[PDB]
From a paper:
MRGPRX1, a Mas-related GPCR (MRGPR), is a key receptor for itch perception and targeting MRGPRX1 may have potential to treat both chronic itch and pain. All ligands of MRGPRX1 occupied a shallower ligand pocket than those in most class A GPCRs, with a vertical distance ranging from 12.8 Å to 17.9 Å from the conserved “toggle switch” position of G2296.48.
Moreover, the structure of MRGPRX1-Gi1 bound to venom CNF-Tx2 was determined at a global resolution of 2.8 Å. Putative EM densities fitting part of the sequence of CNF-Tx2 could be located in the CNF-Tx2-MRGPRX1-Gi1 complex structure but could not be unambiguously assigned, which may be due to the multiple potential binding modes involving the repeated presence of the core sequence R14F15/R17I18 of CNF-Tx26. Compared with mode 2 the CNF-Tx2 in mode 1 fits better with EM density. We then performed a molecular dynamics simulation by including side chain atoms that were not defined by EM density and the result indicated that model 1 was more stable. Notably, R17 of CNF-Tx2 in our simulated structure derived from mode 1 formed Hydrogen bonds or charge interactions with E1574.60 and D1775.36. Importantly, whereas F239A mutation showed no significant effects on CNF-Tx2-induced MRGPRX1 activation, mutations of E157A, and D177A each significantly reduced or totally abolished CNF-Tx2-induced MRGPRX1 activation. The mutations Y99A, E157A, L160A and L240A significantly damaged CNF-Tx2-induced MRGPRX1 activation. In addition to providing structural knowledge for recognition previous proposed C-terminal Rφ motif (φ indicated a hydrophobic residue), we also found that the N-terminal to the Rφ motif, the F15 of CNF-Tx2 is surrounded by large hydrophobic residues of Y822.60, Y993.29, F2366.55, and H2547.35.
Author numbering:
A (entry chain L): 14 to 18
B (entry chain G): 8 to 64
C (entry chain R): 28 to 85, 95 to 162, 174 to 204, 211 to 241, 250 to 278
D (entry chain B): 5 to 340
E (entry chain A): 5 to 55, 182 to 233, 241 to 353
F (entry chain S): 2 to 120, 135 to 246
Write the structure that this text describes.
């Protein structure tokens, strides 16, 4: 849920 | 030890009957040798890289 | 933030702190098997600190590259802590029976594990893998301190040494794990992020100051 | 003391003779000599190997190959132009302090704390390097050895003697004597008709090889003389002591010429050598570096600062194109 | 480069790979320097162990290789070659306990010990001290008080104390009290256990040197 | 120093064979080894090479794939595995040792030869195949290359060999101006670049045979045609 991408 | 005290005297006697030249004359020969052979000393005058075997033969 | 410049002013020292050590040792000595680990530690430290130097900007390679180095650097830290414990538990084995190039074998082995886990977090994308990550992070926590207190009870049972062991353990823990025990924590109020990446830029900065320089003299 | 009272008067009789041959001085003659400039040498090669400290080194006659000895028990022959290794000779004893390369190039010699000089053959029809002969008879450690030809070699030992050997049989031909202190260095004349030696009684003697007699004795140092080298003309030589000073002697004036000392130098000298024309004097120190001196005016001309420990060996090729220095940090460097 | 010059490079690389193998093999052995006085017992410890300028001895104890060097047969200025042995693992010093009355000899040994222990090169090597002939030493003291050797000796003429007074007068000559330990053993000719004492005296040296190779 | 080879014999086309060459009297592990063959009544031809440490192998283009070379240093033996033998591989194979360092003399000792009967590249133009001669008079032998053999390090890589009637070749001159240890002082060599000459003075009844010039500049070694000297 953190656009931890 | 009396024999050892005689060979030293003999050696000293031998080392006294030689010929000696003036110090100025001997010092006026190292100068001549150095000035006659100066040109062939690569450590005195840097040698160009074109004929130095340790940089760029 | 207010001063994310905090980190900019701390990786200033740090980016270069490892650069000289990367070359000093990278040119001379490096005979000690201990030095290999430090060489890989400093080599992998640069990349983390440099990637974070870029965040000034504030896409594709900026994210997997600092996480790959983060878990790479933490591995060669607990690997150097368990190598000094073996040098005193089994001193005869460490001298004459220890195989050569063992450190080189285990240094390239650490490099792989780190890559592999980074991909699987990218395969989770293009599931719950974090447990595994979180769980592997606390493995190194008890491997490090759980084998760096044995070094005290096999010695204490000299005082300018005891201090070193509580110096390095605290640095790896008080300003180490917080960053990674935190990110993944919350992927499943938050200035907790900001404070932590500083500390993570501070741990990785003063690595040579101790694993190398305090010993350079 | 039947006659010990006249040796002192004999010695006093030769003092006043070497002092009535001193009208002038070397400085008073070379005062207006052109300065030698500022010598700047740069490292061209670095020979890596020999894990332990390096104690001895010698150049080959072709000015391309050199041999070095180390305390790990190895003899390595290097090709300096390409940094290649030609041979690696394992020694039977690892305590070595001396190496020489023959003028023909077929043999090398070794010696140390085993009181034995070993001779190796480099040209064999089997591909390896073989021991050719071991020479025994010195009762102290061997400090220097110098080939005369393929079949003769002069060694100096810590038992205060020097010897001349025959290799094809393995026995001494002449035994030189008179020093009362261990001999530490040798130097052969360019014609190899006589040689000088320096011992730990702060004296140097000249001997001729044929008659085996001592000709002249030179005094003036204050402690052990560790290095000695002969001028290119063959009428002078230089010595290096542990009192931080080098001196130049004349064989024809029979006395002292010049001293090379600085007030900021306190460590002893390990090695000494001349350049091709005899204008520069290379000296190695425990300061970790190497000074060069203008021989005719006694001024420093430059420094050679590139070693991390004590400089133990130092030599110049036969055409005067390069200088090689060994050291205790196990590295060999070639300069200019 | 030509084929012949490329083959010289290959040969050079081949022989420097063997120089690494020999260097690693020699860094596992421990080397010891055997010093002592004239006929002090140095010619006896070597036979306790399993086993011409200098002599080298080889023995193995619990998968560890030892190399001992003897420099007794060398009457040459010691300051000229003693630096060759710096970096040695440890030093063994043999002192005969019964040389008190003899002539003096004990004083010569205290001087020799004082000179080698306080060397410039040996500033961090450890010293293992052997006090030989502890048996024959007993037959003399009961008929010869220690005052004939140590004048200021304030004690009894008994083994229990006279033997501990020479150990303290030898271990007190140290000046760099901290960087060097001194392990003193009391040997007796048929002691059957000196090699073990050397083993667990050099084990601590190995441990201390391991704490430096890791910079700890 | 000794080299003995065996393994040859009658073979049908397409078959296989294995040749051996066992050393005796020298440090076999320090030498690189070559295979050189000679056709019936024709000249010499290089075949293959193996490195001292067995870390370098070269093959002629005419035997690549079919032939493979190997050595066994603990037993001091050299092998050559050959498969799918054509009718133009019938020759007499030789075992040659060579060592390479600054100042060495390669190609110095040749084996005795084992016979085999079945069923870009520098050229070296040899001189007239036949020179009539009488004892006493001095003669000259001329080789000529299709490329300058003078390298930039100063060396010229030309070699001279002599094959006496009924024997194996022996080295005379290496690198064009050096005399191999064992040959008299009447042999000498000159020339530079692409033209070379070997001159012998006051020949006796021991210089009869054929002379070969060989270049060692590149990978595939090549030989001259060879010139006979009859009395």
């Amino acid at each position: 849920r953190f656009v931890r991408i | 030890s009396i024999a050892q005290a005689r060979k030293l005297v003999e050696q000293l006697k031998m080392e006294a009957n030689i010929d000696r030249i003036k110090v100025s004359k001997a010092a006026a020969d190292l100068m001549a040798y150095c000035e006659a052979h100066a040109k062939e000393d690569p450590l005195l005058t840097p040698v160009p890289a074109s004929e130095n075997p340790f940089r760029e033969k | 933030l207010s001063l994310t410049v905090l980190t900019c002013i701390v990786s200033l020292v740090g980016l270069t702190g490892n650069a000289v050590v990367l070359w000093l040792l990278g040119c001379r000595m490096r005979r000690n098997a201990f030095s290999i680990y430090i060489l890989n530690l400093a080599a992998a430290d640069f990349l983390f600190l440099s990637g974070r130097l870029i965040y000034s900007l504030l896409s594709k390679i900026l994210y997997p590259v600092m996480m790959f180095s983060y878990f790479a650097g933490l591995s060669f830290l607990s690997a150097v802590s368990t190598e000094r414990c073996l040098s005193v538990l089994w001193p005869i084995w460490y001298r004459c029976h220890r195989p050569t190039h063992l450190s080189a074998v285990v240094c390239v082995l650490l490099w792989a594990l780190s890559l592999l886990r980074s991909i699987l977090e990218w395969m989770l994308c293009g599931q719950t893998s974090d447990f595994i990550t979180v769980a592997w992070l606390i493995f190194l926590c008890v491997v490090l301190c759980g084998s760096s207190l044995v070094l005290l009870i096999r010695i204490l049972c000299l005082t300018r040494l005891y201090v070193t062991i509580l110096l390095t353990v605290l640095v790896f823990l008080l300003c180490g794990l917080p960053f990674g025990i935190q990110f993944f924590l919350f992927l499943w109020f938050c200035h907790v992020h900001l404070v932590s990446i500083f500390l993570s830029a501070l741990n990785s900065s003063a690595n040579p100051i101790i694993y190398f320089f305090v010993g350079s003299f | 003391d039947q006659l010990r009272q006249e040796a002192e008067q004999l010695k006093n009789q030769i003092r006043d003779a070497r002092k009535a041959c001193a009208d002038a001085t070397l400085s008073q003659i070379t005062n207006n000599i052109d300065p030698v400039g500022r010598i700047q040498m740069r490292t061209r090669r670095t020979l890596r190997g020999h894990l332990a400290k390096i104690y001895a080194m010698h150049w080959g006659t072709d000015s391309r190959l050199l041999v070095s000895a180390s305390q790990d028990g190895k003899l390595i022959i290097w090709d300096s132009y390409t940094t290649n290794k030609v041979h690696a000779i394992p020694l039977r004893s690892s305590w070595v302090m001396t190496c020489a390369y023959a003028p023909s190039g077929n043999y090398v010699a070794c010696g140390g704390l085993d009181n034995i000089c070993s001779i190796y053959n480099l040209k064999t029809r089997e591909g390896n390097v073989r021991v050719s002969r071991e020479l025994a008879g010195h009762t102290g450690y061997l400090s220097c050895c110098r080939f005369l030809d393929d079949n003769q070699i002069v060694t100096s030992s810590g038992d205060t003697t020097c010897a001349l050997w025959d290799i094809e049989t393995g026995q001494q031909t002449t035994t030189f004597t008179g020093h009362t202190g261990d001999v530490m260095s040798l130097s052969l004349a360019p014609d190899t008709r006589l040689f000088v030696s320096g011992a730990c009684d702060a004296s140097a003697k000249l001997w001729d090889v044929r008659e085996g007699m001592c000709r002249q004795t030179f005094t003036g140092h204050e402690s052990d003389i560790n290095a000695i080298c002969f001028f290119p003309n063959g009428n002078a030589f230089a010595t290096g002591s542990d009192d931080a000073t080098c001196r130049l002697f004349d064989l024809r004036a029979d006395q002292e010429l010049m001293t090379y000392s600085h007030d900021n130098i306190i460590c002893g000298i390990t090695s000494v050598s001349f350049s091709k024309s005899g204008r520069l004097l290379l000296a190695g120190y425990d300061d970790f570096n190497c000074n060069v001196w203008d021989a005719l005016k006694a001024d420093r001309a430059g420094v050679l600062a590139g070693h991390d420990n004590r400089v133990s060996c130092l030599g110049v090729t036969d055409d005067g194109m390069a200088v090689a220095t060994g050291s205790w940090d196990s590295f060999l460097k070639i300069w200019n | 480069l030509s084929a012949e010059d490329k083959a010289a490079v290959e040969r050079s690389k081949m022989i420097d790979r063997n120089l690494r193998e020999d260097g690693e093999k020699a860094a596992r052995e421990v080397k010891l320097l055997l010093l002592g006085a004239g006929e002090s017992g140095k010619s006896t410890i070597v036979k306790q162990m399993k086993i011409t300028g200098i002599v080298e001895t080889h023995f193995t104890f619990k998968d560890l290789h030892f190399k001992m060097f003897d420099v007794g047969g060398q009457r040459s200025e010691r300051k000229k070659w003693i630096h060759c042995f710096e970096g040695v693992t440890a030093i063994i010093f043999c002192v005969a306990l019964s040389d008190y009355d003899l002539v003096n000899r004990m004083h010569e040994s205290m001087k020799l010990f004082d000179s080698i222990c306080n060397n410039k090169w040996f500033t961090d090597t450890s010293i293992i001290l052997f006090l030989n002939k502890k048996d024959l030493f007993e037959e003399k003291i009961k008929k010869s008080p220690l005052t004939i050797c140590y004048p200021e000796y304030a004690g009894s003429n008994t083994y229990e104390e006279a033997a501990a007074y020479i150990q303290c007068q030898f271990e007190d000559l140290n000046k760099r009290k901290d960087t060097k330990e001194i392990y003193t053993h009391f040997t007796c000719a048929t002691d059957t256990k000196n090699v073990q004492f050397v083993f667990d005296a050099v084990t601590d040296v190995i441990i201390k040197n391991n704490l430096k190779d890791c910079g700890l | 120093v000794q080299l003995v080879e065996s393994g040859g014999g009658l073979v049908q086309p397409g078959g296989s064979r294995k040749l051996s060459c066992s050393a005796s009297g020298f440090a076999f592990s320090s030498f690189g080894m070559h295979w050189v063959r000679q056709a019936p009544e024709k000249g010499l031809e290089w075949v293959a090479y193996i490195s001292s440490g067995s870390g370098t192998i070269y093959y002629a283009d005419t035997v690549k794939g079919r032939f493979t070379i190997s050595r066994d240093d603990p037993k001091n033996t050299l092998f050559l595995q050959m498969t799918s033998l054509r009718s133009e591989d019938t020759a007499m194979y030789y075992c040659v040792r060579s060592i390479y360092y600054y100042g060495s003399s390669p190609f110095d000792f040749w084996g005795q030869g084992t016979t085999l009967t079945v069923s870009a590249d520098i050229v070296m133009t040899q001189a007239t195949s036949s020179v009539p001669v009488t004892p006493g008079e001095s003669v000259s032998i001329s080789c000529r290359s299709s490329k300058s053999l003078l390298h930039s390090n100063g060396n010229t890589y030309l070699y001279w060999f002599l094959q006496r009637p009924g024997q194996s070749p022996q080295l005379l001159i290496y690198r064009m101006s050096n005399l191999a240890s064992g040959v008299p002082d009447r042999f000498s060599g000159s020339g530079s670049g692409t033209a070379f000459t070997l001159t012998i003075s006051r020949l006796e009844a021991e210089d009869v045979g054929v002379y070969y010039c060989m270049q060692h500049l590149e990978y595939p070694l090549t030989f001259g045609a060879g010139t006979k000297l009859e009395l």
